[PDB]
Amino acid sequence: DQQLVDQLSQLKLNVKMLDNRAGENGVDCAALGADWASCNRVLFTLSNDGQAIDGKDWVIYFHSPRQTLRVDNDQFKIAHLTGDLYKLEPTAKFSGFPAGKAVEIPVVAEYWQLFRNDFLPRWYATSGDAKPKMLANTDTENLDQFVAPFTGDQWKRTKDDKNILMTPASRFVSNADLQTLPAGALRGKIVPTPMQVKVHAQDADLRKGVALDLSTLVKPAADVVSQRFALLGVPVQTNGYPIKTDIQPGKFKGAMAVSGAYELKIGKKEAQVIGFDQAGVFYGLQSILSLVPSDGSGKIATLDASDAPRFPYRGIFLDVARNFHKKDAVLRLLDQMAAYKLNKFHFHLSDDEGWRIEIPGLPELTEVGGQRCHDLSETTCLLPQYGQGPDVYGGFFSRQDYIDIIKYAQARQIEVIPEIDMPAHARAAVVSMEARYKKLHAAGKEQEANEFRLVDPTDTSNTTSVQFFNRQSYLNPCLDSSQRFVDKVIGEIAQMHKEAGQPIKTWHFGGDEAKNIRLGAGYTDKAKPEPGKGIIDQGNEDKPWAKSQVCQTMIKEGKVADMEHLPSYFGQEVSKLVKAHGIDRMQAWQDGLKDAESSKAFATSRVGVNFWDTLYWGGFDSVNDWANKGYEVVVSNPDYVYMDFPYEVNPDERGYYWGTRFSDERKVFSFAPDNMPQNAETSVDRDGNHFNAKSDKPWPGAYGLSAQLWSETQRTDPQMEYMIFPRALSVAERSWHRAGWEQDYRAGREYKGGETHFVDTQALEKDWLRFANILGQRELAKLDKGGVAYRLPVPGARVAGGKLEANIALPGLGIEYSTDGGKQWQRYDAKAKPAVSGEVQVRSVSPDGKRYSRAEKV
């Protein structure tokens, strides 16, 4: 009843990592069914400051990205519901939560939990009658409230992990090649770097404003520029410094004769931008704006530049499905994209845990699919996921919100690419269409009920998705109703884009992870168990749709060879629907199209792939095959450009980390997307090891670059901003500009980390030093003005010769220190270092002085 839930809600949870490598220390993880026999031991402690809790009619619900494999307190048991949702219940041996005591519940979980961020907030209790209530101390984004600090070598994945733990003292070393450059060295430095620039000695004075000639641009685009001058403190006035614009396509030739190319001339008395097109004029103006200083001086260098993008596709991907992000956050992101010349916004509007776009005629998609809540029937909500609590959590973009976003991107020269992921990652759609089926069926409207149904009622397939959903995560690609649904959704979204004035150019089908993870290599069968693998019953495991009667008859009429080819077949079918709606380009995650012959198998004349294999695993050679089969390769490697991964190897950092342990601003900048093998000399794998890379295959080149923000642990808008910025500025650089240390691809050349010395790393280092200085001394102050809650790096520090020496990853940023336990903070001056004794803590501060990094002790 309610009393029982009220009692449980007052239990205080404490989570403590016990052993991240339990398999190395005597636990038989294989016998517990752990993938690759890898498992960890965690302690859950529930403390009771009230009277004894003796009822047994209760369930405690919690979230975890890891499966629980064993519970080592026999008074309790843990069962999986679906996705990340688990339940803790009393067994027959349960004898209560004693008054004033703590109960300890040790568990064994699959894999490892290397970051405190792995542990999710908002545990909640239920009981018969009662409304669910959270365990109050867990109702927070501050993990310090319920998760103990990691100690010792608990951050290590294996005993052989070679990653380096980042503390002030080891960070000082990683940053020691950096120094603060004199302002003079940053004169005339546009970001992203222009193809060609000649800086002159005179400066142009913008203090009394600029007189803009934006006649070449449509009003909304011209308004963007005017607003941005004003934001950075340069008033627009007729009597100001004249900036003239023109469009002259005929002045550009060959590979410079592309959208976004421009010629820029900044003189002492006036400036002139000549674009190939409107994007080109807009970009030349963003280049001038990039030069506006953050010291209030309003002076910029005179110069002559000629520029054009290295790639036509310079993207940012955003997941709003896992956790929603508000329209205002999306707009702020589009502003920054335009400022650094990123032009493709890949909008992941749906997944298992949410559906975020209103679709005329299919209200259940947003009414049910748009919200999560504790509704076991999933008639009004999808089940809770990701530690957002038991109560309604969600949101979606109305049709007008969506049109607003498209207009906003269009003014900024950004193309909106909608993604409706299928045939896997489709639980929100499948469950919503099941609520629709039920509703209409109840009213006796059977044909309407079945019209858009995404389930074959005969299907009894036993399949487990990557996030531990079952067959409802997979829309059935064999149903005519499924094709009706796709067609309807394409139609409705294409209409919004037409209304917004930016007709869809690319439809993104998704296509990722359409498989049963239990048939993967790290699992083995109970009957003939291979050593080192998770022992499960694999005989009851099906490939997706294997038990669907409709898919079986499709295989018999000769349409598809086998069940495994369904995702690719479905992609071919969707391309026809895409083409039928007047869209001539389709894009997908490459694994979804792996069984298609070539780009020739699709109805659109253009087919792009987001290439998301990791390099150290072989991605440096497998990418060639996509380009050579006719696909436009959009480089999206998780080991460099996944922005849901941590900035540094520190257990208090945010992010997932399956593809790599960290990717900071520097690592992202150092990525060479058009000569993938060369990254073997400039980076390390996920365990900090050097790797080797070679390809003998032809490489025609990449079509683009994309950086992804997946939203599993980015529960809030500020968290999303922390994760994207400032490292998206490194993405903008690399997607626009090909550096001198980025070598031409050479078939048969083998780069061996730690061994070969093909790459010019001194050139790389010098380029990064300048770029880091431009961020710390100029651009982060502009992010402050755009209201973006970017990550502030923690300083590096050491104590030497009795004084504090501190440094930072982005030189120019302010540093503070405290010698009293972090109560009084003082500014660090490098030319008058402070004499220090005892415990010292350091933190950085934003240019506007309002925000601080996390504080760490040296």
XYZ file of N, CA, C and O in Angstrom, residues 119-204:
344
model
N 26.083 4.734 -13.406
C 25.040 4.571 -12.420
C 24.003 5.690 -12.564
O 24.310 6.849 -12.600
N 22.751 5.237 -12.726
C 21.638 6.100 -13.018
C 20.821 6.461 -11.822
O 20.606 5.643 -10.912
N 20.334 7.687 -11.771
C 19.532 8.225 -10.699
C 18.090 7.723 -10.716
O 17.647 7.057 -11.674
N 17.285 8.137 -9.751
C 15.862 7.999 -9.697
C 15.290 6.597 -9.680
O 14.498 6.092 -10.483
N 15.774 5.856 -8.652
C 15.220 4.585 -8.202
C 13.810 4.913 -7.651
O 13.617 5.989 -7.098
N 12.871 3.983 -7.767
C 11.526 4.299 -7.286
C 10.878 3.040 -6.764
O 11.223 1.980 -7.195
N 9.925 3.186 -5.887
C 9.246 2.094 -5.235
C 7.761 2.061 -5.601
O 7.134 3.083 -5.847
N 7.219 0.866 -5.654
C 5.858 0.612 -5.907
C 5.340 -0.450 -4.940
O 6.078 -1.240 -4.360
N 4.026 -0.492 -4.797
C 3.385 -1.501 -3.941
C 1.898 -1.551 -4.262
O 1.243 -0.496 -4.163
N 1.343 -2.677 -4.521
C -0.064 -2.855 -4.801
C -0.753 -1.597 -5.294
O -0.583 -1.191 -6.467
N -1.546 -1.002 -4.426
C -2.329 0.167 -4.561
C -1.653 1.420 -5.173
O -2.006 2.040 -6.196
N -0.753 1.912 -4.389
C 0.017 3.020 -4.349
C 0.548 3.575 -5.648
O 0.815 2.965 -6.669
N 0.733 4.884 -5.631
C 1.421 5.616 -6.646
C 2.953 5.478 -6.361
O 3.336 5.616 -5.215
N 3.703 5.304 -7.432
C 5.166 5.187 -7.343
C 5.790 6.433 -6.767
O 5.359 7.585 -7.092
N 6.799 6.273 -5.916
C 7.569 7.333 -5.352
C 9.060 7.053 -5.480
O 9.479 5.906 -5.227
N 9.851 8.049 -5.827
C 11.283 7.846 -5.891
C 11.929 7.703 -4.506
O 11.461 8.290 -3.572
N 13.065 7.042 -4.480
C 13.985 7.032 -3.332
C 14.649 8.441 -3.397
O 15.337 8.743 -4.362
N 14.242 9.288 -2.482
C 14.511 10.715 -2.486
C 15.939 11.109 -2.666
O 16.229 12.016 -3.471
N 16.897 10.410 -2.058
C 18.295 10.822 -2.241
C 18.802 10.566 -3.646
O 19.865 11.055 -3.999
N 18.093 9.778 -4.452
C 18.513 9.463 -5.803
C 17.897 10.395 -6.820
O 18.151 10.304 -8.006
N 17.013 11.276 -6.385
C 16.315 12.179 -7.273
C 17.211 13.405 -7.506
O 17.026 14.463 -6.901
N 18.187 13.212 -8.361
C 19.204 14.206 -8.567
C 20.037 13.909 -9.804
O 20.195 12.769 -10.230
N 20.664 15.000 -10.306
C 21.679 14.818 -11.324
C 23.078 14.773 -10.674
O 24.087 14.553 -11.336
N 23.186 15.024 -9.387
C 24.477 15.006 -8.689
C 24.771 13.621 -8.132
O 24.275 13.255 -7.091
N 25.580 12.869 -8.875
C 25.874 11.483 -8.510
C 26.566 11.366 -7.179
O 26.432 10.328 -6.532
N 27.242 12.428 -6.746
C 27.873 12.404 -5.431
C 26.895 12.126 -4.319
O 27.291 11.651 -3.252
N 25.603 12.377 -4.540
C 24.600 12.108 -3.558
C 24.399 10.622 -3.322
O 23.909 10.272 -2.244
N 24.699 9.748 -4.286
C 24.417 8.329 -4.020
C 25.468 7.411 -4.538
O 25.380 6.193 -4.363
N 26.489 7.896 -5.255
C 27.516 7.029 -5.835
C 28.859 7.357 -5.189
O 29.339 8.506 -5.273
N 29.474 6.363 -4.595
C 30.770 6.565 -3.969
C 31.816 6.870 -5.027
O 31.743 6.468 -6.179
N 32.858 7.604 -4.622
C 34.020 7.885 -5.434
C 34.765 6.615 -5.826
O 34.755 5.613 -5.066
N 35.342 6.593 -7.003
C 36.149 5.442 -7.415
C 37.524 5.597 -6.731
O 37.974 6.742 -6.531
N 38.130 4.510 -6.405
C 39.434 4.474 -5.757
C 40.394 3.557 -6.504
O 40.022 2.753 -7.349
N 41.689 3.657 -6.155
C 42.675 2.785 -6.731
C 42.612 2.670 -8.244
O 42.537 3.659 -8.973
N 42.644 1.439 -8.728
C 42.647 1.159 -10.144
C 41.289 0.706 -10.647
O 41.157 0.012 -11.648
N 40.221 1.146 -10.002
C 38.862 0.829 -10.399
C 38.464 1.370 -11.743
O 37.512 0.882 -12.315
N 39.164 2.343 -12.293
C 38.931 2.874 -13.627
C 39.423 1.973 -14.720
O 39.126 2.160 -15.911
N 40.302 0.986 -14.406
C 40.859 0.096 -15.398
C 39.881 -0.961 -15.909
O 39.213 -1.616 -15.106
N 39.866 -1.177 -17.226
C 38.997 -2.161 -17.825
C 39.504 -3.599 -17.628
O 38.759 -4.546 -17.518
N 40.807 -3.777 -17.761
C 41.545 -5.006 -17.605
C 42.855 -4.667 -16.868
O 43.254 -3.518 -16.747
N 43.549 -5.729 -16.414
C 44.798 -5.499 -15.686
C 45.854 -4.883 -16.612
O 46.742 -4.183 -16.137
N 45.707 -5.064 -17.924
C 46.568 -4.534 -18.941
C 46.189 -3.170 -19.548
O 46.819 -2.754 -20.529
N 45.163 -2.519 -19.034
C 44.722 -1.244 -19.554
C 45.895 -0.274 -19.528
O 46.500 -0.056 -18.465
N 46.174 0.351 -20.639
C 47.253 1.304 -20.770
C 46.796 2.744 -20.821
O 47.614 3.650 -21.081
N 45.497 2.973 -20.596
C 45.031 4.369 -20.574
C 45.694 5.080 -19.390
O 46.093 4.441 -18.418
N 45.787 6.380 -19.486
C 46.357 7.170 -18.411
C 45.283 7.918 -17.647
O 44.624 8.772 -18.230
N 45.237 7.679 -16.360
C 44.335 8.368 -15.476
C 44.742 9.851 -15.362
O 45.898 10.176 -15.143
N 43.750 10.724 -15.584
C 43.971 12.162 -15.560
C 43.602 12.760 -14.219
O 42.462 12.712 -13.753
N 44.617 13.302 -13.543
C 44.585 14.060 -12.294
C 45.341 15.371 -12.595
O 46.003 15.426 -13.636
N 45.330 16.356 -11.770
C 46.041 17.610 -12.045
C 47.460 17.371 -12.407
O 47.972 17.903 -13.398
N 48.170 16.480 -11.687
C 49.569 16.185 -11.946
C 49.845 15.468 -13.235
O 50.822 15.835 -13.916
N 49.040 14.488 -13.665
C 49.273 13.818 -14.947
C 48.737 14.651 -16.108
O 49.275 14.643 -17.225
N 47.693 15.452 -15.843
C 47.168 16.386 -16.840
C 48.184 17.480 -17.166
O 48.294 17.873 -18.327
N 48.921 17.958 -16.168
C 49.997 18.927 -16.364
C 50.950 18.433 -17.429
O 51.335 19.148 -18.346
N 51.340 17.166 -17.373
C 52.180 16.539 -18.342
C 51.549 16.433 -19.702
O 52.154 16.762 -20.761
N 50.288 16.029 -19.801
C 49.662 15.936 -21.120
C 49.568 17.318 -21.751
O 49.576 17.424 -22.971
N 49.501 18.392 -20.977
C 49.357 19.741 -21.467
C 50.702 20.494 -21.590
O 50.698 21.699 -21.912
N 51.775 19.845 -21.258
C 53.034 20.605 -21.104
C 53.617 21.113 -22.391
O 54.455 22.055 -22.310
N 53.236 20.668 -23.565
C 53.687 21.148 -24.851
C 52.936 22.397 -25.322
O 53.229 22.969 -26.383
N 51.923 22.772 -24.591
C 51.106 23.907 -24.829
C 51.711 25.112 -24.072
O 52.459 24.952 -23.097
N 51.489 26.276 -24.577
C 51.902 27.528 -24.002
C 50.938 28.617 -24.491
O 50.251 28.356 -25.480
N 50.885 29.722 -23.810
C 50.063 30.842 -24.210
C 50.797 31.677 -25.236
O 51.923 32.089 -24.997
N 50.189 31.858 -26.388
C 50.776 32.624 -27.468
C 50.396 34.089 -27.275
O 49.345 34.422 -26.760
N 51.340 34.922 -27.672
C 51.120 36.361 -27.647
C 49.981 36.667 -28.640
O 49.866 36.023 -29.708
N 49.180 37.622 -28.309
C 48.051 38.053 -29.173
C 48.475 38.305 -30.597
O 47.730 37.962 -31.568
N 49.667 38.831 -30.816
C 50.216 39.068 -32.132
C 50.243 37.888 -33.035
O 50.093 37.992 -34.275
N 50.449 36.677 -32.491
C 50.501 35.454 -33.276
C 49.141 34.980 -33.752
O 49.102 34.064 -34.549
N 48.052 35.526 -33.236
C 46.701 35.089 -33.544
C 45.965 36.065 -34.453
O 44.807 35.946 -34.831
N 46.758 37.072 -34.884
C 46.320 38.060 -35.824
C 45.961 37.469 -37.173
O 46.737 36.724 -37.777
N 44.752 37.792 -37.684
C 44.315 37.323 -38.966
C 44.016 35.849 -39.059
O 44.028 35.286 -40.157
N 43.745 35.199 -37.916
C 43.468 33.761 -37.895
C 41.949 33.476 -37.826
O 41.299 33.696 -36.851
N 41.470 33.077 -38.989
C 40.067 32.706 -39.190
C 39.909 31.228 -38.813
O 40.766 30.418 -39.106
N 38.758 30.886 -38.198
C 38.417 29.497 -37.901
C 37.037 29.199 -38.495
O 36.117 30.049 -38.282
N 36.894 28.151 -39.222
C 37.894 27.222 -39.644
C 38.971 27.845 -40.553
O 38.731 28.851 -41.211
N 40.175 27.274 -40.542
C 41.250 27.792 -41.389
C 40.856 27.877 -42.850
O 40.409 26.888 -43.447
N 41.058 29.033 -43.494
C 40.782 29.239 -44.897
C 41.800 28.531 -45.777
O 42.936 28.258 -45.362
N 41.414 28.186 -46.988
C 42.282 27.521 -47.915
C 43.582 28.345 -48.184
O 44.645 27.734 -48.312
N 43.423 29.627 -48.288
C 44.539 30.503 -48.607
C 44.283 31.848 -47.993
O 43.218 32.411 -48.106
N 45.255 32.385 -47.307
C 45.136 33.682 -46.674
C 46.502 34.383 -46.665
O 47.546 33.763 -46.516
N 46.423 35.674 -46.887
C 47.561 36.571 -46.808
C 47.175 37.726 -45.886
O 46.346 38.549 -46.228
N 47.796 37.791 -44.721
C 47.554 38.779 -43.715
C 48.501 39.987 -43.903
O 49.700 39.787 -44.086
N 47.924 41.139 -43.812
C 48.666 42.390 -43.991
C 48.880 43.051 -42.645
O 48.257 42.721 -41.627
N 49.785 44.058 -42.609
C 50.162 44.678 -41.351
C 49.153 45.620 -40.758
O 49.187 45.809 -39.520
N 48.320 46.248 -41.553
C 47.328 47.183 -41.061
C 46.110 46.429 -40.486
O 45.783 45.311 -40.920
N 45.424 47.109 -39.600
C 44.199 46.628 -39.017
C 43.007 47.501 -39.444
O 43.165 48.647 -39.797
N 41.835 46.866 -39.478
C 40.595 47.575 -39.772
C 39.928 47.832 -38.422
O 40.000 47.024 -37.503
